[PDB]
Symmetry: D2
Subunit: 260 residues, 4 copies
């Protein structure tokens, strides 16, 4: 697991929705590679636990602030807290995304529809507008979006969610084209089924409910992902190892086929 990579010394990153699951793994990895990192999530207790968890592993260049990521007030607070703690911003990882609905797409209300886009898409656009001048002032940097494999393969039950993630593919690209002039590279990841609280209902009926899911999902590599499976990609995308890559999505799904 320790790569000895230290591609982030003297960089500051914000990772949204990063007190559990994929986001926390991303933050941990950036911290292992020498970054200072601000994490956030809604619940102060989750922030507290995540900060304690990281500091217990010796990763002390971390701070946390509780906030709703789709609140414009909390967005500004997150960005200002980052600047207060660490003086600058190099990287933004828009990891947040919700999935409240489960059902047929025709049963998604106009309100639930709007909420899905508000949190899953709009909030990342807003965060991007706020961090932009700060990242540009450092001569450039990176923004990463956590979309989903379901951007590409429309899933049953969470199809409206999936559509938001398709949107993030386009937003990743549009921001990439637009922020290239500031040497800000914008890329994304499109994870498959990762074992987290969000996907729990699909995989928490034993070893064999997990194997049956691996089967149905058609996962070449024959297992479900874990949060750490995303982190090496995020680190790669936010580092100089990808300095000539912008506007791309990397599918992290164990070999599930949804585009060429």
């Amino acid at each position: 697991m320790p790569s000895n990579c230290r591609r982030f010394e003297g960089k500051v990153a914000i990772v949204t929705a990063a007190t559990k699951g994929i986001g926390l793994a991303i933050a941990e990895r950036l911290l292992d590679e020498g970054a200072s990192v601000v994490i956030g999530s809604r619940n102060q207790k989750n922030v507290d636990e995540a900060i304690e968890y990281l500091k217990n592993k010796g990763l002390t260049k971390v701070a946390g602030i509780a906030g709703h990521i789709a609140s414009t007030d909390d967005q500004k607070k997150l960005v200002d807290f980052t600047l207060q703690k660490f003086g600058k911003i190099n990287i933004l990882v828009n990891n947040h995304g919700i999935n409240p609905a489960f059902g047929h797409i025709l049963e998604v209300s106009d309100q639930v529809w709007d909420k899905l886009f508000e949190v899953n898409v709009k909030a990342g656009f807003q965060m991007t507008k706020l961090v932009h001048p700060h990242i540009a002032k450092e001569g450039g940097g990176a923004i990463i979006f956590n979309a989903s494999y379901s951007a590409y393969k429309s899933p049953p039950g969470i199809a409206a969610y999936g559509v938001t993630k398709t949107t993030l593919v386009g937003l990743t690209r549009a921001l990439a084209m637009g922020l290239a002039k500031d040497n800000i590279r914008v890329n994304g990841i499109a994870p498959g089924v990762i074992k987290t609280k969000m996907s729990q209902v699909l995989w928490d009926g034993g070893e064999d409910a997990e194997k049956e899911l691996t089967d149905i999902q058609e996962i070449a590599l024959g297992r479900l992902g874990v949060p750490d499976d995303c982190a090496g990609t995020v680190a790669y995308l936010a580092s100089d190892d990808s300095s000539y890559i912008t506007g791309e999505m990397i599918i992290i799904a164990g070999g599930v086929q949804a585009r060429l």
Copy 2:
């Protein structure tokens, strides 16, 4: 131009935003192939002119109703008027889409962002929910979305618009997966630069402002599209000639390359 195709005898279609440009061409073609068609747009005068234009060519199974497509009141009025005039609904063509902004994506306000999605995406989802039970009652039918080539290649100046069109790719797919159980096929078109009022600012500086655009756009076929270039595809997608095709987007851009 006359194909002698009559694949739409005894079918009823709604074509939104169909008093000018691509939408009117789509309506004309469906009418040539024997459909009854309802068109709509905001301005009653545009509705009146379009109906007169079609009736002068002998295409009399047409009716029109003025309405804002993103108004829930007007959506219901459009669908109810269709049922009042023609008794059923087989096909919906969600042709509407706006593009008010021109500038950098970072300059798009939260409000303009939401408006873009409201009209370009949400309204088609809403129209789809309203027509759904009526189409299903006929044993199936078709829904077509007019997205854009800029779903795939993020353009300068209208990038937020482009993102909405990416979203429509995902929405087309999600609706396709979800409405297959009702034998409702959902597909889209992704046009390149079509000469209409919407794209006018790009191509209305003579023959050579058009040739310079053809160059920059990298259009293999060396010309800009016209509304009629979309109509044969829509007809194809809404007919039995595509009865085994659902969830697809067809790029109609004269050979511009943006996916495999």
Copy 3:
């Protein structure tokens, strides 16, 4: 539904490997729309039966010539026969393709590999170079490739075959970019599982081996294709209904998802 479409009066098409299945349906449809058509396949008896079958339906503007499609001698004979019979060539449908192997990709010999590419790709390139000057002389026309959905979703057992079909996506595009100057549009179809002799081993355990296959395959529309499901698309792509479309693949797979 016989469509009444008559988009091909005065046009001549060559449809390769067109004495059974998809190719014969393509030829029949072009003939219904008023084309003159040359078909070919290896076996003179199959040629004879196909010609008899078409002439019994009153489609008499057809001729046939037996030949191996990957033989350079037979390619030249096919094109020269077409010019002798009908004087010109407007359309080429490269329908041919084989799949001798079934097994793991690692068990495909170098020889079988080369044969797959020779017939599935190279022969279409060769036919394209032979018809090219003749189609250009008519002011343009169309060339269609029959690839496969398995170009996009790598299948088990016939993966090497699948790779040849991926190649055809690229070849379709490359020829489109290259022949646009001659107003020759080059597009393709990428069918899913179509019930023919070729795909028989996948679907031939009764009507619920077919329903089990449509769940494994995740076919939204809940059924397997038939040859006629491809024909409407080919006709569309070869007609003026698609006059602004070049370089594109249309997946004809009942809603199987493999790209955006």
Copy 4:
């Protein structure tokens, strides 16, 4: 930035066609991260210079063997030399690829066509079959293909070449699906214009012929690539940082848009 990454201690890689350009940068990076590496190319003098160059930087876990990559004798010699020198094989990087033709696709002879596929595709398939049992014996590993952005965007002048690279996308995927059972991940890179001897004719009219090329090409990041721009990606794809990623292509083109 030398990354301090050391993800390849105790691993052995073969990098084909790796005495200049992208391949040599790939080899150098794997060596910096602690791998043992075998390189090869046709010309013994190039092998000698590359080995001297690497050993002068202190990267001594390298060996070289001259050979033609599309020779079955030389393929076997390369794999056997690697096993003789280092005892095992964990990683294969199929970097090789040629482009002899420059002109229209219609001017590509059958012979040149076959040669393009022989070297650009078949040789990678062959190398994959030879290394396969050895990599499987280590419990898995990785195979990387160097395709090209021109797999996705068909270029003028080298279109046949481009088609071979499209094929590699398919081959990457097919091998990924097929070798997943052995925990061998197969991924690729699709570079844009990288400044090497191979691409020299496109970019070698001074520093503003380079800037003119970056506008024609629509390279968001406003510059041409260098070999080192590929290496970080290869290292990432061959390391545990991508342990849940198989079947994917990463475009490394400074933000040129060619798929979603």
